[PDB]
Design a protein around this ligand. Structure first.
Ligand SMILES: *[C@@H]1O[C@H](CO)[C@@H](O[C@@H]2O[C@H](CO)[C@@H](O)[C@H](O)[C@H]2NC(C)=O)[C@H](O)[C@H]1NC(C)=O
Ligand SMILES: CC(=O)N[C@@H]1[C@@H](O)[C@H](O)[C@@H](CO)O[C@H]1O
Lengths: 148, 180, 281, 98, 93
């Protein structure tokens, strides 16, 4: 079981054309784009109906998954996070036992095997979740409107 | 400083000059060819002065298409003028690269090399600032060697290029380089 | 030296403006007969296209010569356009020569170019141990260029005994920082083949892995790594956003524009014998 | 084109597959990911997504020019040529009856 | 050489080669000499003008990075932030 979140550079989320169908398109490089179904709600707003449909997804990370597939061959289903976020620690509104939410959360709870995502590598999560070598090198930055 | 003058030489390479003169007389010969196929020496005169743009002013090419040939020619002449212009741009703006000496955070000073030598007066209050700290400890460790008795001596020494740099209090030195 | 400025940066100062120069130039040619009451117009306003060349006498037309004043302001204004073009030469340095890529073509076939090209790395290179998988012929040909030690290699690049050099980005960056003068840099922005990194491996099949893991994790926790490179990786040189400059006004490319000239004169020979052929009927 | 990266780059970081606690899958996966980075597979991934540059670089540019200014100058030129036809006829009449 | 004169200096500043004739008076011809000099000065004027028309762009865009004094002291002026519940924030915590 694999989980992620809509994220601009990597995840692309569009509905199926009729049902379960994803428009087959090529690249600027002419590549026969590989895509697959994905489950998650289309809401993104808090406090709204959570009912989920499989829409289509494609992207970078998705590719990396397929690379795993041709590498380690096994069945997989892919879904997003209940919320629209990654995750943070916290406690319950009462009695304050350490808890979690987010992709981390569905993982610790066990709702999925796999988190495929531009995952920040921290100290804390590794005190829970295992790590790989990095598959990309990114870092912090800031963004603002270009000069007129 | 190493930036000045070089005169008529600076704004080109010898090869370019070979192109201008040699190919100039060449296209001149082309003009004379356009004359005798269907103002002989006066032609090469005309294009030569054209590249000179000095207004020799004898006459012009008769053949219309050939007159267009010389037209593009004079265009390329303007291109050569502009060439001299951008050349001049190189002859002025965009000076040489950094002088280093960015200050106490200069990586240069951060890792002492036999390359550059920077130090201060033997028994300097400056050194006293340098004595108790964690960071310079490498530096203070490196700076006992070449320190001098009187800063004036240092001025002399770097002034002889026997020093890369010297450490002191600013105002004094502002006075110094302000002098020399 | 460079850079790659074949006189068409002036066209960046203009581009379709020139098209307007043709068309509106013909408009002025119409203005000649208009204010009159053929090629004279051409040599005239085209005379204005730069400093006067064609000796041809100015048109005696008062209002006509006033139009000549119009194309005169147009002309000096255009000279200004080329002034700012030279300005475009002032800034605008590509600072790009041999930079292509790890798998790119210019390095793909060593025998391809005329002058012997050579690049490579040290033996037993981890990076190289990847390079063998990158392409075989590469290791094969570069075997003759292998070198012992990093320093004298650098000295051979500065001296010119070798073109370029293959290694990990590490010493490229740091060594790039430290040099007597600022000269060398990696190709491109730092695009790196074999995305990888340094770390600390240990005795296999331990538990101490996770522990040290969380450790240097915490090392980015304080972000002390900032301090760390600050004491080490900090460079003086580069900041390649600045384009540096050149001198000597050495242009083979602009000479290329001169080749556009001469070739245009050849076209003039073509149409020359052509119109000569039009003289029969 | 509307936006620009920040000046510096900080908080060295990276991305690896999320997996829980201890399951053997870690080694296999990461080993495989080296098994990509060993070759241009990743760079290929740029070619699939990151590589495509929709706009120019960060720039701030040295310079460039398009027809706006020259449209104004050449405009006063041509409108001055028509003005030269108008006043041309006018002065033509003046000197004609002078 | 009456109206043709103002013609001559007008075109001189134009430097377009009207080319009717010249000033006869030697001292006055020196007057026009200095004149044409100042014309060249006006051309160069257009040149340096163009220099302004190209190099030396506008001032800084700020955003110098995490050490930007701007970010160091929050103002209602500029607003800089991140995602609610961001691993980034986790670094910032
Ligand atoms: C790279 O590794 C090779 C072996 O993998 C080294 O080869 C040895 O080189 C020394 C001197 O060059 C010889 O005396 C040995 O006989 C070589 N052994 C083998 C197995 O080839 C080589 O020296 C290493 N590179 C460098 C720069 O030392
Ligand atoms: C809660 C919500 O926003 N749901 C949207 C809505 O358009 C619809 O229920 C579904 C199927 O199109 O797509 C999603």
């Amino acid at each position: 079981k694999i989980v992620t979140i809509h994220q601009e550079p990597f995840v692309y989320v569009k509905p199926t054309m009729s049902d379960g169908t994803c428009k087959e398109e090529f690249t600027v490089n002419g590549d026969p784009v590989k895509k697959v179904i994905c489950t998650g709600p289309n809401d993104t707003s808090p406090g709204s109906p959570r009912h989920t449909v499989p829409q289509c997804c494609y992207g970078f990370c998705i590719d990396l998954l397929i690379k795993l597939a041709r590498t380690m061959q096994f069945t997989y289903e892919v879904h997003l996070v209940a919320d629209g976020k990654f995750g943070t620690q916290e406690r319950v509104q009462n009695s304050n036992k350490k808890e979690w939410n987010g992709m981390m959360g569905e993982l610790l709870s066990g709702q999925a095997d796999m988190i495929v995502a531009p995952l920040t590598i921290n100290n804390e999560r590794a005190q829970y979740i295992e790590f790989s070598k990095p598959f990309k090198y990114q870092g912090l930055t800031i963004l603002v409107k270009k000069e007129i | 400083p190493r930036s000045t003058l070089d005169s008529f030489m600076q704004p080109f390479q010898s090869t370019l000059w070979l192109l201008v003169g040699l190919s100039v007389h060449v296209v001149a010969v082309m003009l004379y060819l356009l004359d005798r196929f269907s103002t002989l020496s006066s032609a090469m005169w005309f294009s030569w002065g054209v590249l000179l743009n000095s207004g020799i002013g004898e006459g012009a090419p008769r053949s219309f298409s050939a007159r267009i040939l010389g037209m593009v020619w004079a265009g390329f002449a303007m291109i050569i003028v502009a060439s001299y212009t951008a050349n001049l741009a190189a002859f002025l703006v965009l000076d040489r690269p950094e002088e280093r000496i960015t200050g106490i955070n200069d990586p240069r000073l951060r890792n002492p090399s036999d390359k550059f030598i920077y130090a201060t007066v033997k028994q300097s209050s400056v050194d006293i600032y340098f004595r108790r700290q964690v960071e310079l400890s490498t530096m203070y460790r490196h700076m006992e060697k070449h320190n001098y008795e009187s800063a004036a001596e240092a001025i002399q020494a770097v002034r002889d290029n026997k020093l890369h740099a010297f450490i002191w209090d600013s105002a004094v030195l502002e006075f110094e380089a302000s002098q020399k | 030296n460079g850079t790659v400025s074949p006189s068409a940066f002036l066209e960046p100062f203009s581009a379709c403006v020139w098209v307007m120069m043709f068309v509106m130039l013909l408009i002025v040619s119409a203005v000649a007969v208009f204010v009159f009451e053929i090629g004279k117009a051409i040599w005239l306003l085209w005379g204005l296209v730069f400093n006067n060349s064609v000796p041809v006498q100015n048109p005696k037309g008062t209002t006509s010569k006033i139009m000549v004043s119009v194309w005169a302001f147009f002309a000096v204004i255009f000279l200004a356009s080329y002034t700012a073009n030279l300005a475009a030469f002032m800034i605008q340095e590509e600072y790009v020569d041999q930079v292509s890529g790890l798998s790119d073509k210019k390095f793909q076939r060593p025998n391809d170019f005329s002058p012997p090209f050579r690049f490579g790395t040290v033996p037993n290179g981890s990076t190289e141990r990847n390079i063998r998988n990158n392409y075989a012929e590469m290791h094969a040909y570069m075997g003759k260029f292998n070198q012992r030690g990093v320093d004298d290699a650098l000295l051979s690049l500065k001296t010119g005994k070798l073109d370029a050099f293959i290694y990990d980005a590490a010493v490229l960056n740091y060594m790039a920082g430290r040099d007597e003068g600022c000269k060398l840099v990696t190709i491109g922005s730092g695009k790196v083949f074999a995305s990888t990194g340094y770390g600390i491996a240990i005795q296999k099949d331990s538990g101490w892995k996770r522990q040290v893991d969380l450790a240097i994790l915490q090392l980015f926790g304080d972000g002390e790594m900032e301090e760390l490179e600050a004491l080490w990786l900090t460079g003086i040189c580069h900041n390649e956003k600045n384009e540096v400059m050149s001198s000597q006004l050495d242009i083979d490319n602009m000479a290329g524009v001169f080749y556009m000239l001469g070739a245009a004169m050849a076209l003039s020979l073509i149409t020359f014998i052509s119109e000569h052929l039009f003289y029969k009927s | 084109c509307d936006l620009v990266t920040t000046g510096e780059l900080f908080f060295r970081s990276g991305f690896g597959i999320g997996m829980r606690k201890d399951s053997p899958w870690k080694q296999q996966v990461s080993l495989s990911i080296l098994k990509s980075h060993e070759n241009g597979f990743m760079e290929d991934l740029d070619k699939t997504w990151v590589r495509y540059q929709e706009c120019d670089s960060r720039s701030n540019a040295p310079a460039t020019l398009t027809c706006e200014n020259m449209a104004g100058v050449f405009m006063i030129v041509a409108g001055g040529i028509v003005a030269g036809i108008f006043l041309i006829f006018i002065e033509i009449a003046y000197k004609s009856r002078a």
